[PDB]
Design a binder for this molecule. Structure first.
Ligand SMILES: Nc1ncnc2c1ncn2[C@@H]1O[C@H](COP(=O)(O)OP(=O)(O)OP(=O)(O)O)[C@@H](O)[C@H]1O
Ligand SMILES: NCCc1ccc(S(=O)(=O)F)cc1
Lengths: 418, 426
């Protein structure tokens, strides 16, 4: 009791009913139904049928499908090279290797201060009426892996999204050209609830197939886990948080260092919380988070990512010499601690006055303006290469006095400072 | 415009212009936004007024008050050696020095894994109906600075609480004994909203007074800052304001080590996400989270574990500053890393078990799964009134790492293993 397996609907079935399943390999399972849809059935292990399966092929990239893997782009049915199982119990393709290499997001708030690393669970922490989806959109079309031998793919999964802003994605993905490396799953709010739950399992497995059996680094974007939750919320329990676990388990470097599975799940605070109680998704926050701040949003900054509450637990693995540029951490640390103080001094100005501040504190204050204005703010079609990211850093690091530059080495300064 | 709290000496009207004498004597302009019975809120852009003053004295510590410094414990008025500005424009007593030494909070999930350092701003991220208020009380009772020659004190601050909770706090703080080190500021939801927003200013001005002028390490606790936002929101006839984010900055400025190093002001604000959202939108309190945050998770509450602090989301940025070798204990960091990873792994394997069954698991994988179970049970779970010393905290960490095999213990130096692992420890 506890787990779930998603099975093909061969016959109409009831509730709490004894039935059989023909697994991906074989191991026959004793289970009971929980809920049903039109083609999919959920069964808790501990008539005769078989698991719902994903048509795994390199022909998945370039095509758009629904949560159950049904086509949406008007095109044909996906021709399956293999017939893999949804819940990632097929190969067990992950290694006992720590996430190491670097992935470029294009956004400097991430790439600079909270670097994303090949195989990481870096969620975006957000709320309603915030541009999180449009950040995820920007990642999908701008993401790449500078240097790596392996091809790069993106798996974009949407859950509980409305028609009007479903066409948003459909248009964006095609009119950018970044479809030819991206498998896109869409799940409508109007779509069956059981189809929502299976969506990320279809998304992750598609990436697992690609990363392992075609040795490529794959980045998965799950837009709003909260919406995944509200479908599970309504499903009718002692699986509440362990189900979440089965989703954040599927992250890291695959067997044979060539490929990778990386995640950016969006977690956002709901429209209503009392009538629809939202679980703490804190289980997903283990390798850091990317905080989106309403404060930066209200002063007209995109992307409104507050770097301070944000971090990447594995950044130090994917930065510096060879991976990026050796002065990466040197700049990051300085930019962080720099912006950190300038921001706190913004309180000190309100207390004592603009004309009562130290000249030291004023150049720190103004730095916080510059960081938000010139570094944090980038266009929606601005794909800042890691060099620029670091360079824009240096440009604003010139404003604060040199003898106040935190802990950097002279060699890092004298060479890379204008 | 930024709001300044003014001593009511004269009747005032809305939008009227005033000239406030400062803590030193630099007269400044502004206009009236709102007022209480005896306090006036003024935004800086003929009448001259004085700033609100705190009845500052060593003679505090023991008495409970209102957010205006008005006695609640039936005792006398506070006899002030000096009445200094509450807006912080009295001293600026903070030094250009990074928070260093350690604070014994008594809780493992904080002390061990997310160590609290003197002068830090480490919030407790919570939600509706979580034990956050209980954690605060436990910290207040237990907190200490071992070894440190500076006298330790705790300043407690309540915003928009209820009478039930007011009796919960007052009663505890008295009988537990932690009052002869505590200045308690209590403000309940029926005390004018004007006094609610002044409450943290008072608490911080008391903290600033003790730390600087009396060589003190002071710990400030602001309970539920989402209620403070609620008072900011519903302010005057003149969705959240513009000065809202800027106003919080006047609070999270006031923390750190005092001039001359002989004292500090440490900050534990409570940030709890509310019930509704279309009514009461959630504020961007991310202005506070800069030096880490402590996360209390429902998952652990629902399983019946106090304190329900999840260490994986939790963090302290400046932990390294007050930990190990005559600070806590040399091994400390080598234990934290190994516990964190061992819990992170286990936590993951609670999923893999639901994918391929309990039996269909690896030998090593089963051990980390069981570790993740022991972590919550014996390292996370601690009594409401047990003050675990760092030595205890870490030795518990050793009694838990024994369950894991030695060849898997990697985030730790071997010179630490042969010295401290119960199977070796000669
Ligand atoms: N001279 C300095 N060089 C580099 N970093 C410094 C210096 N002085 C302070 N800092 C940084 O500032 C932080 C001090 O924390 P504290 O909360 O006391 O100040 P703050 O609120 O960041 O800034 P302020 O008090 O000026 O508004 C430390 O994390 C430290 O790294
Ligand atoms: N709504 C109460 C606001 C208020 C309260 C008191 C005054 S005063 O006349 O006493 F100065 C003025 C305005």
């Amino acid at each position: 009791a506890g787990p779930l397996i998603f099975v093909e609907k061969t016959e109409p079935v009831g509730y709490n009913e004894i039935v059989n399943i023909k697994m991906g390999d074989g191991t026959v399972r004793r289970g009971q139904v929980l809920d049903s849809s039109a083609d999919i059935v959920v069964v808790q292990v501990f008539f005769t049928g078989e698991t719902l399966k994903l048509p795994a092929s390199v022909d998945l990239l370039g095509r758009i499908l629904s949560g159950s893997g049904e086509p949406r782009d008007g095109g044909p049915r996906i021709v399956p090279d293999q017939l893999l199982d949804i819940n990632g119990a097929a190969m067990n393709p992950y290694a006992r290797l720590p996430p190491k290499d670097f992935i470029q997001t294009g956004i400097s708030t991430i790439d600079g201060t909270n670097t994303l690393v090949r195989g990481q669970k870096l969620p975006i922490f957000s709320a309603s009426g915030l541009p999180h989806n449009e950040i995820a959109l920007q990642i999908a079309r701008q993401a790449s892996v500078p240097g790596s031998e392996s091809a790069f793919a993106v798996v974009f999964a949407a859950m509980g999204i409305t028609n009007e802003e479903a066409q948003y994605f459909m248009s964006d993905f095609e009119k950018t050209g970044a479809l030819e490396r991206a498998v896109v799953f869409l799940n409508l709010a109007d779509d069956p609830a059981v189809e929502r739950i299976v969506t990320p399992r279809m998304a992750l497995t598609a990436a697992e197939y690609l990363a392992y059996e075609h040795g490529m680094h794959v980045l998965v974007i799950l837009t709003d886990i909260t919406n995944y939750a509200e479908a599970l919320r309504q499903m009718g329990p002692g699986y509440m948080y362990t189900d979440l676990a089965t989703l954040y388990e599927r992250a890291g470097i695959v067997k044979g260092a060539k490929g990778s599975v990386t995640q950016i799940p969006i977690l956002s605070m709901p429209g209503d919380d009392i009538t629809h109680p939202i679980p703490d998704l804190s289980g997903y926050i283990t390798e850091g988070q990317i905080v989106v701040a309403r404060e930066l949003h209200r002063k007209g900054i995109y992307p409104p990512i507050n770097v301070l509450p944000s971090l990447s637990r594995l950044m130090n693995s994917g930065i510096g010499a060879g991976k990026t540029r050796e002065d990466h951490k040197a700049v990051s640390d300085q930019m962080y601690a720099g912006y950190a103080e300038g921001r706190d001094l913004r309180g000190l100005v309100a207390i004592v006055g603009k004309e009562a501040l130290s000249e030291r504190d004023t150049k720190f204050l103004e730095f916080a303006d510059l960081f938000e204005d010139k570094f944090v703010r980038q266009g929606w079609n601005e794909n800042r290469t890691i060099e620029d990211t670091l360079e824009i850093g240096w440009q604003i690091l010139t404003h604060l006095p040199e003898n106040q530059l935190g802990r950097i080495d002279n060699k890092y300064i004298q060479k890379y400072h204008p």
